[PDB]
Amino acid sequence: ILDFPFTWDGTHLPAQIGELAPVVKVRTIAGAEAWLVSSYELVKQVLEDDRFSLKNTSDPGVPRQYALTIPPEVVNNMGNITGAGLRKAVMKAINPKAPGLQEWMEEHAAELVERMLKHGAPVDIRSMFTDPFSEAMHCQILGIPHEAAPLLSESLPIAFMNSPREIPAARLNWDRDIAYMTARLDDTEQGLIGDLAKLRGTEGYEHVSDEMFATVGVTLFGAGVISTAGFLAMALVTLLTHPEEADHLADHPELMPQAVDELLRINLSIGDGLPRLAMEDMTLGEVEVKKGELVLVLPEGANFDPSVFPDPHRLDFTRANSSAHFSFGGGSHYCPATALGKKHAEIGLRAVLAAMPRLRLAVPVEQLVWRTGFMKRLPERLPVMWGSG
Numbered sequence: 327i328l329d330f331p332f333t334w335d336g337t338h339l340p341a342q343i344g345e346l347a348p349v350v351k352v353r354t355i356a357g358a359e360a361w362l363v364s365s366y367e368l369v370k371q372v373l374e375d376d377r378f379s380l381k382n383t384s385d386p387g388v389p390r391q392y393a394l395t396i397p398p399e400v401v402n403n404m405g406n407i408t409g410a411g412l413r414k415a416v417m418k419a420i421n422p423k424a425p426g427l428q429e430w431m432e433e434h435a436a437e438l439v440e441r442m443l444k445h446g447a448p449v450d451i452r453s454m455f456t457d458p459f460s461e462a463m464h465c466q467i468l469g470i471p472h473e474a475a476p477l478l479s480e481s482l483p484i485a486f487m488n489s490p491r492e493i494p495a496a497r498l499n500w501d502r503d504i505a506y507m508t509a510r511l512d513d514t515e516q517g518l519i520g521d522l523a524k525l526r527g528t529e530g531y532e533h534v535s536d537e538m539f540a541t542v543g544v545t546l547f548g549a550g551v552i553s554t555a556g557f558l559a560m561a562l563v564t565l566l567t568h569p570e571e572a573d574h575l576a577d578h579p580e581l582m583p584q585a586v587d588e589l590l591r592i593n594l595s596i597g598d599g600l601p602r603l604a605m606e607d608m609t610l611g612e613v614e615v616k617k618g619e620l621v622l623v624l625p626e627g628a629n630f631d632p633s634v635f636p637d638p639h640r641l642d643f644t645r646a647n648s649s650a651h652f653s654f655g656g657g658s659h660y661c662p663a664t665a666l667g668k669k670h671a672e673i674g675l676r677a678v679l680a681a682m683p684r685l686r687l688a689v690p691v692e693q694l695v696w697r698t699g700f701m702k703r704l705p706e707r708l709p710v711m712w713g714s715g
């Protein structure tokens with residue numbers, strides 16, 4: 327019996343990945359059977375076929391990867407936002423081209439980096455950079471006060487838990503976070519919450535409750551902040567384990583857009599599978615998947631498939647097909663925020679590398695503490711030091 331996940335240690339690809347058949351039976355954190363899918367070919371096939379349903383992964387009594395920390399219907403969040411007529415408002419808010427946002431992200435990154443320079447080495451670049459940068463950007467696009475980020479952010483280490491059991495803290499924090507966004511609809515003039523407040527009580531939006539409106543602010547803050555802060559921390563882990571490549575990118579800032587594609591391809595921040603329930607009997611490679619069975623898509627399996635990414639462990643900023651990675655998923659549930667995610671990372675990484683020469687890990691790499699029982703692989707602290715000039 328093979329247990330999934332394999333390890334919370336994000337310093338390199340788990341040894342198990344190179345040994346997997348493209349489709350393997352595993353036992354999940356919740357005790358269920360699942361088909362783990364790890365070849366580039368079959369990851370593509372699952373993500374691009376809607377008979378492998380994300381929505382149905384929260385149906386009553388279905389095999390689970392781990393306990394829900396949200397209402398079951400919120401697994402279909404993007405579908406619900408569309409059905410409620412709120413897709414236009416959401417796509418506008420997550421567009422990095424929104425007026426002033428690029429200049430705001432550049433000034434905020436510059437400001438956080440200057441605070442790290444005034445503090446001096448060593449610093450925890452997660453709590454002084456990746457977290458505050460990701461949090462404040464999400465307050466900015468939601469339209470809410472930046473001083474709300476600490477309190478909403480406090481929910482995140484529990485909200486994205488991968489637990490064998492129901493987490494009582496998840497419901498307490500959800501209700502608190504929903505109440506907070508509900509209050510913001512009454513006093514917010516700008517960004518997404520401002521937009522939603524203008525739609526509320528107008529023709530065509532009679533079917534949208536206050537709770538449904540609030541659920542858009544809570545879910546986009548949570549999914550955006552955990553994925554952006556999670557990626558940027560683990561992009562810094564990649565660069566800190568390849569300091570010659572990190573030095574090269576600091577001297578060639580014109581590489582940054584290509585660099586972010588290769589950092590996404592090589593990233594180890596995904597600590598679980600992308601879940602899909604088989605809505606009918608289906609052949610997947612050499613495996614017969616029965617209706618009702620859970621399928622776990624492993625993006626790191628596809629992204630380190632040597633038949634698509636030759637020498638997959640090599641960090642090659644100029645890899646021609648970097649952007650063919652599955653770190654934003656694929657098919658119908660493809661991440662709607664790729665433009666923002668890529669731009670946020672480019673600005674954040676440029677600010678760090680321009681100002682912190684010869685950036686290095688300030689502790690032995692095997693002295694990092696890895697978060698366990700969590701959707702993302704993440705070091706609890708990321709202490710860094712840097713040269714002078």
Ligand code: HEM
Pocket residue numbers: 380402403404405420546547549550551553554557600601652653654655656658659660661662663664666667668
């Ligand atoms: C580097 C940043 C990011 C990464 C690596 C990332 C990754 C992903 C992935 C892998 C999925 C697919 C889940 C699945 O197929 O089951 C996804 C979906 C999603 N992401 Fe992102 N994401 C990022 C940034 C963001 C941001 C900034 C937001 C929102 C502000 C966001 C909102 C969403 C939403 C709502 C979905 C669900 C889409 C659907 O069901 O159709 N993501 N993301």
Ligand SMILES: O=C1N[C@@H](Cc2ccc(O)cc2)C(=O)N[C@H]1Cc1ccc(O)cc1
Pocket residue numbers: 395396400401402403404485486544545546548549550552553
């Ligand atoms: O299950 C969901 N839940 C929410 C995300 C979410 C999960 C928990 C939470 O407390 C807040 C948001 C969603 O938008 N769609 C789906 C899929 C998902 C999961 C994680 C993630 O980062 C992005 C998407």
Ligand code: HPA
Pocket residue numbers: 553595596597598599600601701702
């Ligand atoms: O890391 C992740 N795991 C599962 N689903 C996700 N949706 C966005 N990011 C993730």
